[PDB]
Structure 1
Amino acid sequence: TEFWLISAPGEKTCQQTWEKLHAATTKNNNLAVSSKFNIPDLKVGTLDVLVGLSDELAKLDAFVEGVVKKVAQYMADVLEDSKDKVQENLLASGVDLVTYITRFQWDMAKYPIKQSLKNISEIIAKGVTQIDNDLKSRASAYNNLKGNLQNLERKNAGSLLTRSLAEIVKKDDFVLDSEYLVTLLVVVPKLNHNDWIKQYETLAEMVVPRSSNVLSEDQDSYLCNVTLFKKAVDDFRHKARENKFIVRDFQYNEEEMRADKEEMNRLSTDKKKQFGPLVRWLKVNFSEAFIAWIHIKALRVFVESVLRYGLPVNFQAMLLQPNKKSVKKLREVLHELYKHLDEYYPYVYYKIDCNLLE
């Protein structure tokens, strides 16, 4: 949803220009939603300030739009679930973007009107720059945690051939701690398991009958421990490979199964410890960046009005929400209402777009 902020002089009072445009814009058709926009009188000064600000605010506008858009994307990146509630979370002053823009108020406490336009612009620039610095830090932390959780997910993904042994291994299936004895682990496709149950007793010399103990099974395969004498292992593994069986050794590795379980408990918990503060920080940073963006838009309108008419300014600030079916007729009405003042327009024009979240 796109909104236009516009301004033009009253002939003797601001009501004359407001009534003429508001009546015409409403009466001809629903060309736009028409309302007053709050811009207060600031302490004006020389053309060196005004012209500098006019271009500097355009750089700041591009920057803050990029920042607040990145905040909206980061909110969608942190909110992995409940994606439909993102617009209900991206609120300014407890209300939706459209409402806040229509009901906009200048923050005289953050931005005292007696200050020069440069000082106001620098307070905005510093505030938004530190929001961007905080976002760089938080995004770096969140993206790394997300990436590390995906590595633990990959380690537990797919069949018995690809998932970690830590989920299925227990000490009771193993023969270990021995001079002459070994345990090995093998994966076999489920169609070959009925042959494997006898074939393992014959793949090497010095293998006992009934040596195979199953850990787990899935839609593709069985994974079993095999117990045997130490001389048998190389022929056993080689002849298993000749018979298409896959070796996947894990001799009750307590350190490896512990490390996967510790990281699962840690990463699953640290995700919440990031997520809660991230949603709260992103809501604050969104509100402040969106508020600051509108303060830049208001300054672009103000500075251009002051340039276009001179320092004793009498411009009304107004908002339009253009109808997509009749925006060309709206442009023609706005030109006709202001043809005496001089894309390009004879009146002051700027736009805002609420589609920060795509």
Structure 2
Amino acid sequence: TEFWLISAPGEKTCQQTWEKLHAATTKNNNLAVSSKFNIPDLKVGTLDVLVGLSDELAKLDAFVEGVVKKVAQYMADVLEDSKDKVQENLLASGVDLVTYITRFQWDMAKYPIKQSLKNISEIIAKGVTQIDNDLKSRASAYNNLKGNLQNLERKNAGSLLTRSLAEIVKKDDFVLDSEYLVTLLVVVPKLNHNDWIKQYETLAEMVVPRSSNVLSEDQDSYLCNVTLFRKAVDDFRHKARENKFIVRDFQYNEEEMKADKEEMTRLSTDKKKQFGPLVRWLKVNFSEAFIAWIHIKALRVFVESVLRYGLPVNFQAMLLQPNKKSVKKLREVLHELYKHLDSSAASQQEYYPYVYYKIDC
């Protein structure tokens, strides 16, 4: 759905009915949704600086397209209760966002209008700035947490060759109180396992007899260990690397397993317990961000409608929703309607004969 903000001189006292749903001037003959817009009560302040005010207002608007669409991108990336294509019903502080758009009410309570327009605009600017700073810091922290969890689950994965043996090797496999030996977990596949058990003596002198022991199984090969004097370890490694045997002088360490698994489970659970607050904070702050968004948009509408008609602030605004593929017909009929206001030229293009702004979800 895509909406169209239109504002008019509002000369007639009854023109509001024409703005809302009057069937004579309705859009696409009662097939396009048209609603009135609650015009905020706003000051003027000045007009000399107002050109610059509108300028930097537009630049701030661009920048906040940036920040709020990044907020949308992140809340979509959370992928818990809200995703790109599912669970996309986005709530403007409790109700459907279109319900808040069609029931727009200026934020009189938070931002009184006795204050000049400039100071209110910078108030909103720095409020958005601190919203953005909080988003950056907190989302970076959550990116760090997610990266930590990803590294944890990555190091908790892999074959025997590419991962420390958690649920495979134990204490009894390695030599205990060893005075001269060292147990090397020389993995041997079944392609040449008889080879290993037959010429492990050829691979090295001064070796433990009957050391042909096999611990566990995996899909690439079979884990097995050899107990060997130091020179025997050198020779066995030297003549087994060529024999397509994985060499590994692993040291049994229950801590290497228990630590990693404990951090994995604790970080996952704490990440979820903190991601609850993430989604609450994110959806809330984005709802108020969109509230202030439509407020600054209404402020723009006011400024441009005013300068369009000079000093007096008399105008009537209205939401709209043209039918797809009926757009151009609406363009030309509204051109016919509004070209009599100026009667000369209001090549209408961007600056329409009506004060216009665009929004799309």
- TM class by shorter-chain length? 0.7 to 0.9
What residue is the counterpart of 2:360 in the other structure? 353
**Do 2:28 and 2:326's aligned partners in 1 also have CA atoms closer than 8 Å?**
no
Alpha-carbon distance change, 134 to 241 in structure 1, aligned in 2, over 3 angstroms = same
Shift of 1:353: 1.9
**Do 2:306 and 2:313's aligned partners in 1 also have CA atoms closer than 8 Å?**
yes
**Do 1:211 and 1:227's aligned partners in 2 also have CA atoms closer than 8 Å?**
yes
Shift of 1:62: 1.2
Shift of 1:336: 2.0
Alpha-carbon distance change, 309 to 344 in structure 1, aligned in 2, over 3 angstroms = closer
**Do 2:27 and 2:34's aligned partners in 1 also have CA atoms closer than 8 Å?**
no
What are structure 2's unaligned runs of at least 5 residues?
Answer: 343-349
**Do 1:36 and 1:319's aligned partners in 2 also have CA atoms closer than 8 Å?**
yes
The worse-fitting range, judged by mean Cα deviation, of 41-50 and 125-134 is: 41-50
Report the 3-state secondary structure (helix = DSSP H, G, I; strand = E; otherwise coil) of the residue aligned with 2:39. Answer: coil
Alpha-carbon distance change, 205 to 288 in structure 1, aligned in 2, over 3 angstroms = same
2:212 and 2:341 mapped to 1: Cα distance?
Answer: 92
Shift of 1:319: 0.7
**Do 1:160 and 1:217's aligned partners in 2 also have CA atoms closer than 8 Å?**
no
Shift of 1:34: 1.0
1:220 and 1:341 mapped to 2: Cα distance?
Answer: 82
The superposition leaves residues 276-326 of structure 1 with CA deviations (integer Å, 9 ceiling, x where unpaired) of: 121111112211211121111111111111111133322111111232221
The worse-fitting range, judged by mean Cα deviation, of 247-256 and 310-319 is: 247-256
TM-score relative to the length of structure 1: 0.88
Root mean square deviation, CA, Å: 2.7
Shift of 1:47: 0.1
The superposition leaves residues 96-115 of structure 1 with CA deviations (integer Å, 9 ceiling, x where unpaired) of: 32222222221111121322
Shift of 1:23: 2.7
**Greater helix percent: which structure?**
1
**Do 1:4 and 1:321's aligned partners in 2 also have CA atoms closer than 8 Å?**
yes
Alpha-carbon distance change, 280 to 16 in structure 1, aligned in 2, over 3 angstroms = closer
Shift of 1:191: 4.5
Shift of 1:131: 0.6
1:349 and 1:60 mapped to 2: Cα distance?
Answer: 18
What are structure 1's unaligned runs of at least 5 residues?
Answer: none
Question: What is the total number of aligned residue pairs between the two structures?
Answer: 354
Report the 3-state secondary structure (helix = DSSP H, G, I; strand = E; otherwise coil) of the residue aligned with 2:87. Answer: helix
2:228 and 2:222 mapped to 1: Cα distance?
Answer: 19
1:113 and 1:282 mapped to 2: Cα distance?
Answer: 28
Report the 3-state secondary structure (helix = DSSP H, G, I; strand = E; otherwise coil) of the residue aligned with 1:24. Answer: coil
**Do 1:65 and 1:293's aligned partners in 2 also have CA atoms closer than 8 Å?**
no
What residue is the counterpart of 2:313 in the other structure? 313
The worse-fitting range, judged by mean Cα deviation, of 72-81 and 126-135 is: 72-81
Alpha-carbon distance change, 39 to 11 in structure 1, aligned in 2, over 3 angstroms = closer
Shift of 1:230: 2.7
**Do 1:201 and 1:211's aligned partners in 2 also have CA atoms closer than 8 Å?**
no
Alpha-carbon distance change, 297 to 193 in structure 1, aligned in 2, over 3 angstroms = farther
**Do 2:211 and 2:227's aligned partners in 1 also have CA atoms closer than 8 Å?**
yes
Alpha-carbon distance change, 53 to 87 in structure 1, aligned in 2, over 3 angstroms = farther
Alpha-carbon distance change, 127 to 86 in structure 1, aligned in 2, over 3 angstroms = farther
Shift of 1:17: 6.9
**Do 2:339 and 2:353's aligned partners in 1 also have CA atoms closer than 8 Å?**
yes
The superposition leaves residues 110-156 of structure 1 with CA deviations (integer Å, 9 ceiling, x where unpaired) of: 12132221122112111110010001101211111222222223323
Shift of 1:194: 5.9
Alpha-carbon distance change, 331 to 21 in structure 1, aligned in 2, over 3 angstroms = farther
1:283 and 1:81 mapped to 2: Cα distance?
Answer: 11
The worse-fitting range, judged by mean Cα deviation, of 331-340 and 280-289 is: 331-340
Alpha-carbon distance change, 203 to 323 in structure 1, aligned in 2, over 3 angstroms = farther
Shift of 1:340: 2.7
Shift of 1:227: 2.5
1:287 and 1:315 mapped to 2: Cα distance?
Answer: 28
What residue is the counterpart of 1:213 in the other structure? 213
**Do 2:77 and 2:84's aligned partners in 1 also have CA atoms closer than 8 Å?**
no
Shift of 1:185: 1.8
Alpha-carbon distance change, 89 to 228 in structure 1, aligned in 2, over 3 angstroms = farther
Shift of 1:27: 6.0
What residue is the counterpart of 1:85 in the other structure? 85
2:325 and 2:201 mapped to 1: Cα distance?
Answer: 80
